[PDB]
Design an enzyme around this catalytic site. Sequence first.
Site, PDB file in Angstrom:
ATOM      1  N   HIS A 122       0.809  -1.168   0.000  1.00  0.00           N
ATOM      2  CA  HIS A 122       0.000   0.000   0.000  1.00  0.00           C
ATOM      3  C   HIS A 122       0.891   1.286   0.000  1.00  0.00           C
ATOM      4  O   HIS A 122       0.757   2.113  -0.855  1.00  0.00           O
ATOM      5  CB  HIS A 122      -0.929  -0.082   1.206  1.00  0.00           C
ATOM      6  CG  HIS A 122      -1.800   1.122   1.361  1.00  0.00           C
ATOM      7  ND1 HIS A 122      -3.003   1.255   0.701  1.00  0.00           N
ATOM      8  CD2 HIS A 122      -1.589   2.288   1.998  1.00  0.00           C
ATOM      9  CE1 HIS A 122      -3.493   2.453   0.940  1.00  0.00           C
ATOM     10  NE2 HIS A 122      -2.658   3.080   1.737  1.00  0.00           N
ATOM     11  N   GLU A 123       1.770   1.452   0.970  1.00  0.00           N
ATOM     12  CA  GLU A 123       2.699   2.584   0.988  1.00  0.00           C
ATOM     13  C   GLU A 123       3.575   2.632  -0.296  1.00  0.00           C
ATOM     14  O   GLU A 123       3.865   3.720  -0.772  1.00  0.00           O
ATOM     15  CB  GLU A 123       3.625   2.513   2.242  1.00  0.00           C
ATOM     16  CG  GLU A 123       2.915   2.457   3.644  1.00  0.00           C
ATOM     17  CD  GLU A 123       1.920   3.620   3.862  1.00  0.00           C
ATOM     18  OE1 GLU A 123       2.252   4.765   3.591  1.00  0.00           O
ATOM     19  OE2 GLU A 123       0.788   3.420   4.331  1.00  0.00           O
ATOM     20  N   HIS A 164       1.956   4.487  -3.153  1.00  0.00           N
ATOM     21  CA  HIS A 164       2.181   5.857  -2.949  1.00  0.00           C
ATOM     22  C   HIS A 164       3.542   6.361  -3.330  1.00  0.00           C
ATOM     23  O   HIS A 164       3.622   7.463  -3.857  1.00  0.00           O
ATOM     24  CB  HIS A 164       2.027   6.202  -1.488  1.00  0.00           C
ATOM     25  CG  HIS A 164       0.632   6.277  -1.085  1.00  0.00           C
ATOM     26  ND1 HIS A 164      -0.321   6.927  -1.847  1.00  0.00           N
ATOM     27  CD2 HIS A 164      -0.014   5.718  -0.036  1.00  0.00           C
ATOM     28  CE1 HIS A 164      -1.490   6.798  -1.241  1.00  0.00           C
ATOM     29  NE2 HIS A 164      -1.304   6.096  -0.140  1.00  0.00           N
ATOM     30  N   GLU A 223      -5.814   8.786  -2.994  1.00  0.00           N
ATOM     31  CA  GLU A 223      -5.917   7.903  -1.824  1.00  0.00           C
ATOM     32  C   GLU A 223      -6.868   6.763  -2.136  1.00  0.00           C
ATOM     33  O   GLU A 223      -6.574   5.615  -1.861  1.00  0.00           O
ATOM     34  CB  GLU A 223      -6.410   8.668  -0.585  1.00  0.00           C
ATOM     35  CG  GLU A 223      -5.420   9.584   0.079  1.00  0.00           C
ATOM     36  CD  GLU A 223      -4.244   8.778   0.629  1.00  0.00           C
ATOM     37  OE1 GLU A 223      -4.449   7.562   0.923  1.00  0.00           O
ATOM     38  OE2 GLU A 223      -3.138   9.369   0.796  1.00  0.00           O
ATOM     39  N   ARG A 267      -9.671  -4.685   4.620  1.00  0.00           N
ATOM     40  CA  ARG A 267     -10.894  -3.976   4.862  1.00  0.00           C
ATOM     41  C   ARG A 267     -11.735  -3.935   3.616  1.00  0.00           C
ATOM     42  O   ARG A 267     -11.256  -3.893   2.488  1.00  0.00           O
ATOM     43  CB  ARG A 267     -10.591  -2.546   5.156  1.00  0.00           C
ATOM     44  CG  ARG A 267      -9.783  -2.296   6.379  1.00  0.00           C
ATOM     45  CD  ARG A 267      -9.654  -0.826   6.621  1.00  0.00           C
ATOM     46  NE  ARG A 267      -9.031  -0.081   5.547  1.00  0.00           N
ATOM     47  CZ  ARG A 267      -9.135   1.246   5.396  1.00  0.00           C
ATOM     48  NH1 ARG A 267      -9.937   1.993   6.205  1.00  0.00           N
ATOM     49  NH2 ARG A 267      -8.462   1.807   4.421  1.00  0.00           N
TER      50      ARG A 267
HETATM   51 ZN   LIG Z   1      -2.891   5.222   1.252  1.00  0.00          ZN
END
Ligand SMILES: [Zn+2]
Lengths: 414, 414
Positions: free
Chosen positions: B211-212, B215, B244, B345
């Site tokens: 996830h990071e 980015h 995001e 999630r």
């Molecule tokens: Zn994020």
Amino acid sequence: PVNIKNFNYNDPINNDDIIMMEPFNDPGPGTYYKAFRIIDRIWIVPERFTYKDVYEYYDPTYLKTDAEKDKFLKTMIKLFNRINSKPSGQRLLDMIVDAIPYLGNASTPPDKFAANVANVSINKKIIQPGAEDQIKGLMTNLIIFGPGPVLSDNFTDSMIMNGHSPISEGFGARMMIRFCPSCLNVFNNVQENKIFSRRAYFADPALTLMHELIHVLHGLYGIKISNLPITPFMQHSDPVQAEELYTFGGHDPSVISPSTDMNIYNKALQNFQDIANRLNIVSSAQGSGIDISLYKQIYKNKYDFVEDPNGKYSVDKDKFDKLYKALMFGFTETNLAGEYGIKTRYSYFSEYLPPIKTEKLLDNTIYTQNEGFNIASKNLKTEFNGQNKAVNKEAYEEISLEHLVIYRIAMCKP
Amino acid sequence: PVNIKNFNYNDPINNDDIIMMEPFNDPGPGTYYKAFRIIDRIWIVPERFTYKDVYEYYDPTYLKTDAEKDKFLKTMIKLFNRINSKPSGQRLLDMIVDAIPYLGNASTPPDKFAANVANVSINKKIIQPGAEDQIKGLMTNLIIFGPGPVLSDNFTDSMIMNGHSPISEGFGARMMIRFCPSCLNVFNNVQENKIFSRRAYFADPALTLMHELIHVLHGLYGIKISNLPITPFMQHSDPVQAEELYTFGGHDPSVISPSTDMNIYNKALQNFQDIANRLNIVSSAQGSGIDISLYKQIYKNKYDFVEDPNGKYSVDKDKFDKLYKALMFGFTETNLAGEYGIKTRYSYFSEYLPPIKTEKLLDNTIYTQNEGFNIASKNLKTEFNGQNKAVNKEAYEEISLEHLVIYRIAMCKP
Ligand SMILES: [Zn+2]
Ligand SMILES: [Zn+2]
């Protein structure tokens, strides 16, 4: 389509559709207010309700004079007339009128009807010249007040009981709204210069009303059901309530899981079955005057129960499925916006900007029953220009800092 | 697939892939740290970063001993090895390695390459016995630190310049992550009793890392682009940032409008064109050693520019479209979760529960490269049981109130 009655604030009390009523149950002697039955089972009370970034609109002076009460009343009627202009809103109003709360709640004996309970009945005062005024019970579906201290905060509720909650257990409950018709929500759209920029729009207050009415409807059916709580940390409710999202745009699979959909489906079904089970054993009423078979028939019609040759009620799966879907996914703010050519926020997560005020909702050059602000003869229909803050400036005025309390979201010790 | 090198914390400084580095630009004499190049252009620094409801995890003692530094380092490598086990994560790592920041920023002359700027270069110290230690510039793509004071708050950033922001203007920028691999996010799923109930799960920290890394990738391409601000009230950023949401699940039409999609598309395209325009006029470097044509070729490859017979670079619309979509919609947390059999999630709006700790990420009976926690031989693959807090209790431990600072969201005077 439902009939909508016209009234003047100063039209005299007649004890029928213009009455004194006490809608919050009793300190014994409580406060009575002048109320107007514009539609069967739906009352307007033109009084204040006294009983990232965030903007609270204060105006202590709103609804203090009789002239302004009259304006509030007329505006509410005009808004219902607007809702009533198209078949979907017509159906919304018919369903509310018909969705009488069950005569009881979790604490009433299952074998009785009980009208004299707080989810069902308020006090009405019969005003007769010459004699002392009598206090009589009165059953309603919807009571609309003016706002409490914060105008910008339209809100629908019940008075919920000791323990149980009828609006989430199939019984349903008489509903109250606090409403400011003249206080307009403001939202954004990122828009293509017919370069991209943020364009500001204001709500059509009839769609704002329709939104609360959806909630009303859910509450009257006893299907305003919460997501499971988030319980161990300290128990609390899910920030993302499925009924809230349903009310905005029906299904939202990217946010609500199919399991959460189903849980709420199953609990609504069980709620209806509970009502059908009650109906099969009701044999009298707590008080006098209640005709049992008449109310059994009403509830059969409301919940669309099947009745067998012995008089026993049951829930048919196809009938429940069709009614559930209508109530949760048929009447949504985005469905209705589309039917009415009303611009709304793009999503449930879009933020509100500071609110604005209109004084012109009774001016037909600015707001009409059939078109709202988006009047084709003024070229305000195209691109919803009539809701566009930069184009339809005459429609509204900005709210000063004398009225507007500003907050920022902070993280604090609990 | 990228090579991932093994290291021990105590392996000696060699000035190549084990170095002393100063990654925050200079008070002149700043603080140097021991860093490990596990992948080309990607460094681990096993040190603390010092330069509705909410749970901050404190642990002042994390990463203080050499033994724990070594454990952090080994865990980071294992996590990269995990990402590296499948073709999608392999592609993620290849693209990061290749996505060298542009030699410059808005304030560098367009006709020059400038390596000696804060978005490009840090200080490295060449340690030689007998002589004074030399300070040399060093270009990197990604530096991974340990956490700052709050462990539960993984976060990726740059050091952003005076005025401009290279990570949103096509230049890109060397990226820094603060990471706690052993600190696990916890989330819910409403689940059917194989009655409905909330089942608690914990994150696979490799997906947390991935996830990071998404980015990171966006930042290195200079396409970490903000939604238009919400500007008049007091200017502020959109709570719902499209990049995001893209990073979580790609398109999200129910939340992000097609106009917002397009705005971000167009600004990324313009950013690439700006880089291509710069490349066409770069004729030298600010300093010595920079071979211009070599770096022109690197950027042509990174941004997938077309080159005409005169050496001029341009942006091809099909090539941009395919690369953009890969970067924004191909690498998402939910795509990768699905590829890796990792539970996450349900949505970007789902809330986090209090975090938990694992000490077992180096134990192959509990967490493996190929399966993470969800190990088929222990029957932990089915229903992602290995991430299920109620089933895989041996994997983790709850965090005490001695470590856990709790806040509630409040509305306060600004
Ligand atoms: Zn994020
Ligand atoms: Zn609502």
